[PDB]
Hints:
Helix content: over 70%
Number of strands: 0
Main location: membrane
Keywords: Antibiotic resistance, Cell inner membrane, Cell membrane, Membrane, Transmembrane, Transmembrane helix, Transport
Subcellular location: Cell inner membrane
InterPro entries: MFS (IPR011701), MFS_dom (IPR020846), MFS_trans_sf (IPR036259), Sugar_transporter_CS (IPR005829)
Bound molecules: chloramphenicol
Shape: globular
Subunit structure: Monomer.
Oligomer: monomer
Amino acid sequence: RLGRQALLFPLCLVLYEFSTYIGNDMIQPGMLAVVEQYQAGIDWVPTSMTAYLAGGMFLQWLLGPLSDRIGRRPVMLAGVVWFIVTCLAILLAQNIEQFTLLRFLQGISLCFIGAVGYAAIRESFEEAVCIKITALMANVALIAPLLGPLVGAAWIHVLPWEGMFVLFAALAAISFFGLQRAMPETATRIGEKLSLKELGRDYKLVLKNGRFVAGALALGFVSLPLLAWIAQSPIIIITGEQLSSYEYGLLQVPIFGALIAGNLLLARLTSRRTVRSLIIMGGWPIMIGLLVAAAATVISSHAYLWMTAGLSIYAFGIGLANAGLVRLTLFASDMSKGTVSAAMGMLQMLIFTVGIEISKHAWLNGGNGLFNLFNLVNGILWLSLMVIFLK
Ligand SMILES: O=C(N[C@H](CO)[C@H](O)c1ccc([N+](=O)[O-])cc1)C(Cl)Cl
């Protein structure tokens, strides 16, 4: 059962990952239907993603050391079950507030992927095989924001939005049974005590590292325009520009195609290039992309093609530079990779959570110009942290 069929474990971890990612990505275009069904304002549309990501930073710090003490199996499986239950519970929401609360509770399921599931992969599989699994997880995470809005935009013309959550729960159910028969128990620290004050001691120690913080924050700021696009794309395009769901879906193609193209180029150049130079290389289309989108929409607020072009060029730089910065940020601290991962995960989520809300009020008040102007300052914040980060 060990050699061939142990791949069911990473496979099911991947499937669970995908279901939680489209859990955000399929829902965003569906938020228009949701918000119309509850008769709520369009300002709750991006907040759906905010609450989801806020839930993802909630148990982050806790899950890694906890699953180390009580085992990774019961923690991972409990997480998948929690995702299924919360996905089904949102059908009873009855209110946009309660909908957002359950959105938050769903987001907690995100914490289980990296802190426990992936920790088990790192423990179960050799550094060799681990690399491939991480690559598969990276590929899938690239496919979600590309396919999700496409499928989601089509879904609301056929089936009710409630059906999407039944879909996520279904895919998660498959991962559950798979993981239940596949995932090994890798936890070393059973049954050792868990000290919250010593745990908090570790997080205060990583936050004292100057280079780490700069790199972790930079990851947040630089990816914020992309996530803000994902969050606000339905209301910017469909409600704001009065375009259709077909145009909405079409515009996602050059943007996330360029993201993928960026990673593909990254994969080809990684042997002859150093992550430091990849950052500088990705830096150009990132700054130019954000500049083009801001400038064009300050001139003419209604040009979404210039904005999309800009976001596409920027997403290409992201694909190239980001995986590199993740490595450097990880290796900028000598502490436990679990504590380090959770810290940078939470720092990014904080920037995403607050950033999406800020981005929302930017667009509500100033339209597209302000949306892109705020995305531009985020790029400059990333650039600013880069000159510090190296050297
Ligand atoms: O960030 C998330 N989801 C985003 C938006 O839904 C999406 O899945 C995504 C995935 C990868 C990515 N990337 O590689 O830069 C960006 C967004 C959370 Cl589900 Cl972790």
